[model samples]
Target chain A: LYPKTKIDWGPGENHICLKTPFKNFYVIELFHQAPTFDKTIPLFISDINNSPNLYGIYNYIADHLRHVVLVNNYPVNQINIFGKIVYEQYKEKEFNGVEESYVILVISDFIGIDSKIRVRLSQEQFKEVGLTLDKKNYGKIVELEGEIYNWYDSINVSKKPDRELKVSKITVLSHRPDGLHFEFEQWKKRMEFRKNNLVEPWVFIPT
Target chain B: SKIILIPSNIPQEFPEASISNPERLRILAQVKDFIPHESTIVIDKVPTITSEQSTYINICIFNLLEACSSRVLVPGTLVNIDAFYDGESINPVDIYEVNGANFTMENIQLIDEMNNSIGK
Candidate 1:
């Protein structure tokens, strides 16, 4: 069984691209650590290329932000991958090449509010986070490895190109034991769905 | 397991001391680069019977073409032989058991000779 929530905005025409500062990407940290555990959701945006008018400032965040941290305090046990459907194709015509976008959602074991924070980064600061951007590699090969407190496993995304823009569908592939794994799962699930709703503008900063 | 004893009538031929004087060691070398890694062979011990002789000799060859090589023999160049027996006891004996077996060959220890440690 799945829970149904307000769509907030209708599909296509009802969706308006919001032009927020690239600096707002930091909010992802706070959403991950919201005061209410249940409200601890991560923010995701899509269609940055076509929706340039909405996310023109995204380049600042992508170039300036380094890393964001989310904390989970609940006690967790078993971890598994869960999702409703596999995302293979997309509604290509509806998206313009100027913007690249995706869905976003959150996940959690406990039903309560929590806290979160986002830290911005500079060109050097972003590289310090060990974020590697490669165009050649695709599919399940792209993964994040490192010590994430209480977190085990990770989610992988498959990317597809539509015209001049690229769309990605991210899914939780696995999780870890204790509270860390479950918390990350909740964040990933919520972010996958929210990508359509939240649009952040970006600009490429030439190094 | 079932055991059957076969009797023979032909005279048993024993290599004379002159022929067996200089130890002749038989070394079989197998080197095939194209053979698949998993290929193997199987060998069964055959008992030799001599006519009018009461004792039987059982010879077991190390089947290197199979997987048992690692367990039975050394990896490199070395001489080996089949078991030999004289007509006397009911139980068959190995080459080392023969009376003049030591005089035929110099027993230099091969690095990886199959020792009693295997199957233990």
Candidate 2:
């Protein structure tokens, strides 16, 4: 289903939130392609051609087109997002007369036709993975498997809502110097899965 | 022995359809979703989604040649399948008809049915 409003990630130049402060935030900007509607137009026309009258035509188009569109639009329950961390921030806050700690991490990629998506992770997840903003962990590539969700920023109240991934499982893919190359290699494998229409278990891919 | 070809009003075959030699019982149903199991699908008798367990059946696909095209079957499309129903479950044969257009009379002995002269 299409969102009622356009999504706003943040005020940054890349339309993402890296400098913004929050309670506890860990982000992964994933490479994702938005589903297209071009193919549905033709199928709708075909249904109209087969219908008898205006009455049948309207219902046929509605029923036939609706099913295909829904299938193509929200096709998957879960996805494995691959990207590299572009930004990370760790800090403590003393606002609201209380002290709080939080971390903002942004993972991103440019291989997909559409722009990147943000993934959320818990602070406990951070400690388990030993992820930090230190130079040692800079630009680490990771794979996050999760369900995509729409987050309407309560503070912003923008016309749109941002898509966020609620991570179920996370894996650090590569931390070597050629990690970007490895990320590209993984993207190729992801595209292969999409091309073949294979529903490989989460073991290697997402359907 | 002499062989005779009789015009019994039943067409030998329908285009893009299958005719079983032994003639098996089957049901008309619509596709729901392709299950995770290999070549398996869930289907329902009515076009509408059904929660009634009796209305839907999971078909084990062995072949798809009669439907003609190798195109992947879309969700909600109609199909006629040859299968065995044991009250509890159904096991469909290899070939299936894609839609109502592809439906044909099963390979059966019309002379024997005429001799009985009773509607079944």
Candidate 3:
């Protein structure tokens, strides 16, 4: 059992602008699309420069509310990188072949990864698991037990290598952040240098 | 790999943008040889194209339809985005070409059909 987290937010659309008390990083919900989803912002990017720390994120949509995305740095492609990192976590915990388990599809940038990544947490098989959607589980990984359906690859919409997993559940042993964190001004300076060579705007920035 | 900077005054609105969103078509119009297909589209200046030996267009194209699908940008607004998987990782069909003298709709469509034959 880990702990719960509470994040205060500011206003913006198309992206969830992160707030202070936390400065170096922010996260955006890529696939979520209801206009109202932005009305009340939730913390999607947690523990900036913090990985393995189980970033806490959520949604207004009922079916998929509790989700998390972690980041180590801004430029290191979040989707490409995190997908691999989470798998590594699963593997280190002795959960074999959990990496490369899912084939993600973007139904809409506003919704989310709609696929087999999600599983019923209370099925009771008990091999292992990561953090559950419980508020208390927001920042920690848990053990997956019960009838958990795992993410395995397949050829659904294209020609590619797809394989089902020999292993389903696994334990998350620890977490770590791979990217370096910057002081607010330093990070903002770097982002501007990268995005437009102008002082770039962000979802969350300290005044 | 070196950074490619597209000239600042690049044009918008590619008449050959018949395949993707009109907005996407517009961006594609600017890049003469580059094509944006079902899974990937080009946007100006998102900071990278991710190649070991790739050259810059100072432009960025990505595999984000949900990012562009059905959005009403201010007409002719150049776009921006975070980098993700490169366009090659997706785009089940053939590459799209820009509109103008060297456009290729029929050929591209033929490639799309070919890609679809593989059970995508």
Candidate 4:
């Protein structure tokens, strides 16, 4: 069995305002990997530039996160890109442009699995899924007020294997400088202690 | 005065030229034309009908009559028409005659059925 390691970074409170004529900015955070913990580490970050290392980090995180079965088994291998402007301090600089700061968090194993899953939505399917494209509510943190279903329960994959999963409801929980948080308190409570327990240790043993 | 054969179903209260919410009209018109319908229609720009601008109007009729019961148009469909009048008058009695009255079809607005606001 592969061992797991917890990776954490930045509580970096220093805000740097740099002036440059470039269209994009790059910020790199370097740290030593705890090779003994698992001989592997998963890095979680945004898809800024097409970086091979970032892709490797994504794959590492996907491999470790376990998939849970709700009503039906939901393949938890999807990565969702969510972000928000945490700090916007305007200052008069050399160039006349908006110097904005954003906290972009690339959440992998949000449900948790290894395979990649594509989300598809049609006009009729959007209505049936009760998906709302309201800009105000999108990406903002909120509570799960309605019923939640797994991808298998909500979709008929046998008939239309290519059909996209309908997102019935999504609620954003919180938005801050740290990161975007969801109202996953209930889910967190249910999932916290389940990490160490094994399904069956030595199933091949004779009864 | 020239005799005009106006249909009885045409509302008497309808303005000389009825303006409809492009979205609604597009759906109804598509159904009438037996064309496949969609929620949105993309175009280079909006068309004008009163000027001498030569523009092309592409109409996408919907086939909602098959299984879908409703024939109503979606909320944001666009309607475009091209109209042109030269600056040099072919007829002397025409009003607002100019030497080169070439206006493109981008001036047409999607007004309501009452020729008011552009609303569904």
**Separate clash counts for every candidate:** 59, 3, 32, 24
lDDT assessment of candidate 3: 0.25
Candidate 2 or 4, higher TM-score?
Answer: 2
**Whole-model lDDT, candidate 1?**
0.22
Maximum-lDDT candidate: 2
Error of 3 at B49 (Å): 18
Q: Per-prediction DockQ scores?
A: 0.01, 0.01, 0.01, 0.01
Record all residue pairs in model 2 with backbone atoms less than 3 Å apart, i.e. clashing: A5-A160, A6-A160, A29-A107
TM-score of each: 0.14, 0.33, 0.17, 0.19
Which tens-of-lDDT digit does each residue in B17-109 have in candidate 1? 132242212111111111124332111111221122343222233333342233223222121222222332111111111111211111211
Residue A35, model 1, lDDT: 37
Query: Compared with the true structure, what per-residue lDDT tens digits does model 4 show for residues A57-152?
Result: 222332322221111111122222222211112222234474432211122212222111222223343223343433222223222211111222
Q: What tens digits encode model 4's per-residue C-alpha lDDT throughout B22-70? A: 1111111111122234522222222232323322223232222242223
Model 3 residue A148 CA deviation (Å) reads 16
lDDT of 3 by residue, A9-46 (tens): 44554244334353333344432222212222111111
Report the CAPRI category for model 2: incorrect
| Order by lDDT, highest first | 2, 3, 1, 4
Q: Encode model 1's per-residue lDDT on A1-207: one tens digit a residue.
A: 686444333344223222233322222222323232233233211211111111122223322221222112111111122221111221212445534322211221211111111111122322243322332111111112111121111221122111111112123332211122332344345344333323222221212
For candidate 4, what is the DockQ-based docking class? incorrect
